Design a protein around this ligand. Structure first.
Ligand SMILES: [Zn+2]
Lengths: 44, 300, 97, 43, 32, 35, 97, 50
RNA sequence: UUUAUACUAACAC
RNA sequence: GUAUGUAU
């Protein structure tokens, strides 16, 4: 139809195991990593 | 069509300087209405922009008069000099040649014995004059010079015709100046002429008839300079001179000044004399009478 | 609208842009943006009053007086009605115009 | 120190520092940025 | 006494509007 | 509706006195220089 | 105001009124305009003369009266663009030229 | 021509303060006009010339 | 026959 | 007198 509507990036990029998979977020305790990060920023 | 017929069409145009192939090109753009100024469009038309030469006509009646009827006649009807049977000039006049004469200038006045030669016919550029008419101007030049030679003086004369589209008469004016101040003038003008106008011109500032006269003294000016377009010219002695052709006349001076400013400096006068205004009118005896009696001794 | 008159005066400072349109528009938008702030610099000078402070002006005036005093300076008069130089002066003025 | 004695003014620019440059402003026309942008591109 | 036009700061410090236990972060330039 | 601050008035009249005073200082100087 | 007073020295009181008055003006551009009380305007034909003599003031707060009279020298016969009378006066100050 | 101008009348007691600013500013006639209220600086200059 | 307006204008200087 | 449309 046009130039822009040609095949491009036929591949998606699912999340690899280290960079932020959804399963690793469940086992992660977001709660405590949040507080500890605020204390460090505040102290400095 | 036809070649022998087509030759006739070409010579007719040659006399009519106002209309050629530039006016048919410039007319076609105004007439076109839809005209985008590109290279894509100018090619897509191409033939449509050149096409004309149907409405052009008139033949002899157009050329005989020249420079329009309404314009030149309006100039001729008002022209304050032009010597005929019918018309008598506004200038008082001193001595009449067959095709020229001496007369006194406007009231502001540059010097005590300031005069001007004027041809009888409507000449404009003094290069358009006949060689028969020019010979009378030469006898005037020598007698006027010899008049001021007894006074211990000498003279510089000049003429200024930056615009012949206006279609004015040309008055070659005589300016009495002392010989030590005369010898400086070659410098003054040479500065003024090179400075005055913008210096990207083609024609090159300064064209010496003083060196040309050594090659051909009878006519250096007439040979070298060209009549058709603008111009300005000064001279020393009979056939010396400096010469400059004028372009961008708006820059030069519409009322005459570039030369008059140089004489306003060289001779040194107040800043109220610099600009020439007034009129000839008539019957101005007390000033022009003193010149006639003095001039008649040296005047043929 | 202000943002842009920033961003395009720094694609002209540099060189990138062309065609009057943009160098015409973002000359307008400045000319306003600047008149806006030559208005405030006036209004907020009559409201905030002279910044010089008399004591400072007194020194500046008096010190100036001593300088002119030291020179034996003559003050420039009003043009006489019989003044040889005025005709010359006028012509110059016009020639400049 | 007789040259500094002759000066008719004294420590004028004495407390010239600090300014509100740290203070962010929600007014594009009356920031410091803009005062520099008009400082530079004019006169 | 005289506040020269250059100084004439129209608005109030970002602190004194909260100015105590709140963190005032001015972030123009990027990092990384 | 806008008005000038009081300091403006102060400034104007402060200069008048300097011009008055200085004028006399010049006439004092001029008289001294005649001797 | 200060200009009006400073000006009043250099010339007649009537001329100096013109200049000072001349500067007030209304400035105009399209939809908008404003008065010009505070600033000095350059468009005037004589705005050179105003800025040179009022610049003179801003030199006589840096130099000081003492040094300035040495540089310019006597008013009767002032020194060259960058010369003095004596070597003593030349070396008296850190400010040479 | 406009309505905002006050052509008619000049009220003595309001007017002795209009010549007062001339002592302050000296010339400066366009900054005087919005204060004095009568505007039309021409007349504000001509009134002090009376 | 005179005066004005527009159209002739795909005119001319 | 076309660019652009209306009628046969
Ligand atoms: Zn003629």
């Amino acid at each position: 139809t046009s130039s822009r509507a040609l095949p491009a990036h036929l591949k998606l990029k699912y999340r690899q195991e280290s960079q932020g998979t959804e399963e690793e977020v469940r086992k992660q305790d977001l709660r405590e990593a949040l507080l500890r990060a605020e204390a460090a920023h505040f102290a400095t | 069509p036809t070649i022998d017929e087509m030759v006739q069409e070409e010579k007719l145009l040659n006399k009519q300087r106002k209309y050629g192939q530039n006016y048919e090109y410039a007319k076609q753009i105004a007439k076109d209405k839809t005209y985008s100024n590109n290279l894509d469009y100018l090619d897509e038309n191409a033939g449509k922009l050149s096409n004309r030469m149907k409405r052009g006509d008139v033949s002899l009646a157009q050329i005989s008069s020249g420079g329009d009827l309404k314009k030149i006649n309006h100039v001729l009807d008002t022209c304050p000099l032009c010597l005929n049977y019918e018309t008598q000039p506004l200038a008082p006049v001193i001595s009449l040649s067959h095709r020229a004469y001496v007369s006194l200038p406007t009231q502001p006045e540059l010097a005590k014995y300031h005069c001007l030669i004027v041809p009888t016919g409507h000449r404009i550029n003094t290069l358009s004059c006949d060689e028969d008419e020019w010979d009378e101007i030469r006898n005037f030049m020598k007698c006027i010079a010899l008049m001021f030679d007894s006074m211990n003086l000498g003279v510089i004369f000049y003429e200024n015709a930056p615009s012949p589209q206006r279609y004015m008469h040309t008055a070659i004016e005589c300016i009495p100046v002392s010989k030590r101040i005369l010898s400086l003038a070659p410098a003054y003008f040479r500065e003024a002429l090179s400075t005055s106008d913008e210096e990207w011109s083609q024609h090159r500032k300064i064209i010496d008839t003083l060196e040309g006269s050594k090659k051909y003294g009878k006519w250096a000016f007439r040979k070298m300079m060209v009549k058709e377009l603008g111009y300005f010219h000064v001279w020393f002695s009979i056939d010396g001179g400096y010469g400059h052709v004028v372009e961008d006349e708006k820059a030069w001076g519409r009322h005459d000044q570039v030369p008059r400013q140089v004489f306003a400096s060289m001779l040194n006068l107040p800043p109220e004399v610099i600009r020439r205004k007034g009129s000839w009118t008539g019957k101005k005896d007390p000033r022009e009478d003193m010149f006639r009696s003095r001039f008649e001794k040296f005047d043929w | 609208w202000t943002s842009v008159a920033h961003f395009n005066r720094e694609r002209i400072r540099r060189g990138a842009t062309v065609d009057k349109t943009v160098a015409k528009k973002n000359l307008g938008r400045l000319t306003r943006l600047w008149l806006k702030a030559e208005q405030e610099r006036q209004h907020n000078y009559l409201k905030d009053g002279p910044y010089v402070t008399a004591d400072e002006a007194v020194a500046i005036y008096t010190t100036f007086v001593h300088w002119l005093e030291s020179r034996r300076f003559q003050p420039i008069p009003f043009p006489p009605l019989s003044y040889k130089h005025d005709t010359k002066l006028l012509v110059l003025a016009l020639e400049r115009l | 120190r007789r040259w500094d004695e002759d000066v008719v003014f004294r420590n004028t620019h004495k407390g010239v520092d600090d300014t509100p440059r740290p203070g962010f402003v929600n007014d594009m026309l009356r920031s410091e940025f803009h005062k520099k942008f008009l400082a530079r591109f004019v006169d | 006494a005289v506040v020269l036009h250059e100084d004439k700061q129209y608005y109030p410090s970002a602190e004194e509007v909260y100015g105590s236990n709140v963190d005032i972060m001015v972030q123009e330039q990027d990092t990384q | 509706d806008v008005e000038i601050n009081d300091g403006f008035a102060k400034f104007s009249e402060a200069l008048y006195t300097v011009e008055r005073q200085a004028r006399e200082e010049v006439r004092y100087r001029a008289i001294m220089r005649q001797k | 105001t200060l200009l009006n007073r400073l000006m009043s020295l250099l010339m007649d009181t009537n001329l100096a009124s013109y200049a000072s008055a001349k500067n007030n003006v209304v400035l105009s551009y399209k939809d908008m305009s404003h008065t010009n009380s505070y600033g000095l305007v350059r468009g005037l034909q004589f705005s050179s003369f105003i800025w040179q003599f009022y610049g003179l003031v801003l030199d006589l707060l840096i130099l000081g009266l003492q040094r300035a009279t040495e540089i310019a020298g006597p008013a009767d016969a002032p020194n060259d663009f960058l010369h003095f009378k004596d070597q003593a006066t030349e070396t008296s100050h850190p400010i040479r030229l | 021509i406009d309505p905002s101008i006050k052509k008619t009348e000049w009220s003595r007691e309001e007017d002795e303060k209009l010549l007062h600013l001339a002592k302050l500013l000296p010339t400066q006639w366009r900054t005087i006009a919005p204060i004095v209220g009568r505007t039309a600086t021409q007349c504000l200059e001509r009134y002090q010339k009376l």
